[model samples]
Target: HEVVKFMDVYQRSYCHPIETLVDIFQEYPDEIEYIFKPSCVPLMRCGGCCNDEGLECVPTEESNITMQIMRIKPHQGQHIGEMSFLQHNKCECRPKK
Candidate 1:
């Protein structure tokens, strides 16, 4: 009662965006008014299916994932991505020994 065999299958990775703010420090001198999220481009992600022997999708970010909304700032320049957040490097499965 085993061996369905999904070895060659894939869940398919994707890159989507969540609504957020954008404070990239441009000089757009316009007296406009709108209401919405904070700023940052939609980040890429890593995921997909793997054979039975492979480990679950590996994330470059830590187990906590990330902070959806927080007061992240810098002394002057922008914050470093690696410390704040990090996307996955690849989707290679870590097969068991």
Candidate 2:
């Protein structure tokens, strides 16, 4: 079942960052045309934090459901997020679909 369903593209990534970004762009080029200034801000500072509003130091550079998606789905909708481990290396292009 979907955690949240939005009128937006959803992506499921694997351990391989290259394959994942390829899939997302190919599948939803309309939403995710390209990733610019990609960076991985570590998440080690959110000690006992519940959420951003709960006094947690969130990463400066991070990924979440796009604003376009959120406007339509809002909270309590589908859950979409990205991975830092993938950015640890560097996502690459793959064979076009």
Candidate 3:
């Protein structure tokens, strides 16, 4: 029953060659985890108060989706963010003891 549904979806959905998919996944390490934040600010510059606050130097094990959301923009104009992969040991923001 479940298997039939999965196969049905797979047949209907866009399908790419296995090697093409493998190439994308190969860029990331085997143990890497995904991080998604509801709120974000420019990398180094502070947004003042809540906005300026830095996310934990290390990624959280998980984020709570039910938490209340806050709104604020960069004071010194808007800044775009880019994905960065930093080694845990090299980052100044170490996990709390």
Candidate 4:
């Protein structure tokens, strides 16, 4: 049987653009056709980039933005009505890093 790879692991030191990531989510919804995999499978949990420089111990500089899209209801004028945040954790992807 032929199995497809869904999730790809990235290093902690990598940096990715926030806008590019959002665009990818907007393009692929529900499932990715290329991988033939569902969107809900692997959720991209991005904490931040690894602190290479010994500037500060707290490492505020390494903190990058990573987000999970909620809904397209507002874009399409759909009535979510008290269900806005509920529609979260869907599409997942990584942009240029």
Scored by lDDT, the top model is 1
Per residue, candidate 1 scores C-alpha lDDT tens digits across 1-97 of: 7654454223333222223233422212231232112444333355544445546545444222343432243443333332134444444555545
Q: Please give the distance, in angstroms, between residue 28's alpha carbon in candidate 1 and its true position after superposition.
A: 28
Q: Put down candidate 2 lDDT per residue, 22-78, tens digits, no spaces.
A: 233333446542442222232222122222332422233323333211212334344
Model 3 scores a C-alpha lDDT of 0.28
Off-target runs (Cα >4 Å) in candidate 3 are 3-73, 86-97
For all candidates in order, the CA lDDT equals 0.37, 0.29, 0.28, 0.30
Candidate 1 clashes between residue pairs 3 or more apart in a chain or in different chains: 20-38, 21-37, 21-38, 21-39, 22-39
Off by over 4 Å in 4: 1-28, 31-45, 52-77, 82-97
TM-scores, each model vs. reference: 0.30, 0.15, 0.15, 0.16
How would you encode candidate 4's per-residue C-alpha lDDT over 58-79 as one tens digit per residue? Answer: 2112223333433333334422
Error of 2 at 96 (Å): 22
Ten residues in a row with the worst lDDT in model 2? 42-51
lDDT of model 3 at residue 81? 38
From the highest lDDT down, the ranking of the candidates is 1, 4, 2, 3
Q: How good is model 4 by TM-score?
A: 0.16
